[PDB]
Symmetry: C3
Subunit: 336 residues, 3 copies
């Protein structure tokens, strides 16, 4: 009565994909929550596989290249992440979902790269307020966390400037394998690329007009019509509304409600094809103490949903009754 009985947990404290310090504390934010306990109580065995140590070079070793900030730290980290994720996914080759906690969203390049190595025909569900598909010369900031998909999408490779250290980062995604949910702050060039190459996307406008139920169904239909493909669920916490997840770097008003987020994860989990879920952009150094607790709370409910937790309840593993303990019940007292 569980689609998944085992699961792996992995921390990736990336903080070089964006300038605000604190995303490196993301994994600890979840580890010090009651997440592991709650999962165990659901009958799921969660193995903490530790953290991936990101490569963080200094200014001298990693200067700007094509406007990109920390691009060599990114490429080295991408490859290290990919190696670890591939290793974990192949050791598990019911399926054993990998739960990844970031860390800024730049980890997704290495995270999907490794995942695809173990499961090449996967699809990606990108839950985010942002496209994260800026090509390097289009990026206004040069922040890597705004470009993780551009290196993975084959159709975009004529817009990615060549770099030797990026050679191992092989584009492993077709535009037809990605679906967006929650978009509300696209750069114009992202909009151009998404429409041009036919990437399936459902913005908050769509969520408003169609309702989250139809959006989820349409998204899954677009990139995984018969539930044949493994699912890579890349969940940016900023997809949720700032009212429920304020502690994140680029909050955008009018987001998914926690319930809507729960629905996406519940449906994805119930397909039986959840292979990797990653939660990005938690920053416990942002906002007040209560802000952090709200964000942590949302993250925990979201992740529990991915592993199959059901708001409609779970049956107990052993039903208990009074007679076994030698205890008189009220019904048994009235019968006498």
């Amino acid at each position: 009565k569980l689609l998944y009985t085992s699961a792996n947990f992995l921390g990736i404290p990336t903080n070089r994909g964006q300038p605000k310090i604190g995303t490196y504390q993301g994994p600890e934010l979840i580890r010090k929550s009651n997440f592991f306990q709650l999962v165990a109580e659901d009958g799921i065995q969660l193995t903490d596989c530790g953290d991936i140590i990101p490569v963080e070079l200094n200014e001298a070793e990693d200067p700007q290249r094509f406007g990109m900030k920390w691009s060599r730290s990114f490429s080295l980290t991408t490859l290290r992440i990919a190696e670890r994720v591939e290793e974990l996914m192949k050791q598990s080759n019911k399926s054993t979902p990998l739960v990844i906690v970031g860390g800024d969203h730049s980890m997704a390049t290495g995270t999907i790269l490794g995942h695809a190595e173990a499961k090449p025909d996967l699809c990606v569900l990108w839950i985010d307020a942002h496209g994260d598909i800026n090509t390097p010369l289009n990026s206004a900031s040069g922040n890597m966390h705004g470009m993780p998909l551009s290196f993975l999408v084959k159709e975009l490779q004529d817009q990615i400037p060549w770099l030797d250290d990026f050679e191992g980062i092989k584009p492993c995604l077709n535009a037809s394998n990605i679906a967006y949910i929650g978009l509300r702050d696209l750069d114009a060039h992202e909009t151009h690329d998404i429409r041009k190459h036919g990437i399936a996307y459902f913005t908050m406008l769509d969520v408003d007009r169609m309702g989250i139920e139809a959006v989820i169904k349409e998204a899954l239909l677009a990139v995984n019509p018969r539930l044949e493909k493994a699912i890579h669920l890349s969940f940016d916490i900023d997809a949720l509304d700032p009212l429920v997840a304020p502690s994140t770097g680029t909050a955008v008003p009018g987001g998914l409600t926690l319930r809507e987020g729960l629905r996406i994860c519940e449906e994805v989990s119930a397909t039986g094809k959840l292979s990797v879920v990653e939660l990005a952009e938690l920053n416990p150094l942002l906002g007040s103490q209560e802000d952090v607790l709200k964000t942590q709370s949302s993250a925990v409910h979201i992740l529990r949903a991915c592993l199959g937790h059901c708001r409609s309840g779970h049956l107990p593993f052993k039903v208990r009754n009074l007679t076994d303990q030698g205890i008189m019940s009220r019904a048994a007292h009235m019968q006498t």
Copy 2:
């Protein structure tokens, strides 16, 4: 043009059903709001019938029994509450709704017991994030506010350990008479009992998929198909989302919006069968000052809705016009 023209108000400052101090201040939180004024302005006569004094024994007199905390305080209080509620309901035998403000949710046992004495064929609409139907040996905490329904449901009596002081607490509810709305944190054993005995329930999952309109309709259909039965509306404030009701003991994210809560109450009120509404688990000692004000505010809008307040507006009792005061109108000035 009012389904109810009179109503009674009753405070029950129960605080022995759960360990956090402050639920005893719940009634005062509402009394010091503009609730009474707003009700009067709607043309409803509200009579404050005072407070029920709970029985609060000391540690020596009330030790743990079957893991339960303050179980004798509970049983004595249950009977005292039942006596008062029965008395009030029979004095009113248009109907005169009883509005009850808690106080933690353990009051419901005595509150429904008394109500059923005056109206035996009633149905219960339980609006809560929790089932509140833990049997004593299944309760993790032993807190009485997590068990008020288990003593009332006939089908559960083989799971309730017998106690002499509990004899007067006669199970007066059939499983088929209860409907849940808003559930999102069921203990596994509660889930077992609810499904086993066929108790109608609609979780936040259901609210998401069906919409609150259909859920309300289905709930009423399940336990009161032809509006024949009196309604006992037991409203736990924690059913609402923590964003609108943070000042409560066991807040759970992803709850009913205030509007959804208003819809439940508006529909229940409009049946003409609202006999008792109780609002439980207000704790003004929890959260910030603004938190308390938000929670108080939500409580007031919820309770006003129960008494028949309409967001679409009310007609005035006497329409006024300029000519009666000897005043020249603009239309009357232009005619000259």
Copy 3:
């Protein structure tokens, strides 16, 4: 690919329509946001036309008349506003929308008066938690911001007491030209007038039962069935829920979500008939610093939506490519 390429911006710091100081800082709250920048990035040319200086008389010059507070300041200000708005609308006679930032809602009398002078067959979409249609002798407070529509509606003129200084304020609206969205706190007499004269209105109850999509469609159908008429969008910030717009004078719980507000504005904008949009009741002197930022943020997203900003994204004005800069792409590197 833009319905509007030009737009005018206008501040009206009215603060004599209600007793709480700070609505006069409303325009500055928006001017010091990134509103202008964001609009420019959408390809729209926004011309700041400055502020209208309200007439603010002293106590001696402006005593109570028929219970009204600052009624002569109101009438003088109404006429000054009307003169400026008419002038701006006729200079623009694609259409050039006028964006007005208040200021309390009493500005609407002069604002609609001037607008109607330039476009007599307009319709009004009133987005507010309140009717703002109290007639002077019915007003409990005498605050002008609760009466701006009563002076404009022809059918109400037998309920408006005549005043010499109000003669120039000619009622230019028929009841059939106004539609309400978002109502949840009507005075009884307002309810009487709205129902009596057949003013189209959709309360939060309607929004709950019908959904915002149907409400918007029905509202537009009621007062602008074939998109023939110019639209006057009068947006009271208190229409939105206090959770997203706390910094306002008369907040009422259970309001429109930001998304619902965005939907109203998006639809109105897309008709191509948005002639004037005004945003009223911003008060940055109310609430905490974060409260002000939330309210400012909501205001900015709302106003951007009115000018045609699309959450589904915009195409760039010039698509850029690597070859023009003499840069080697990854696709161009692999081909060699």
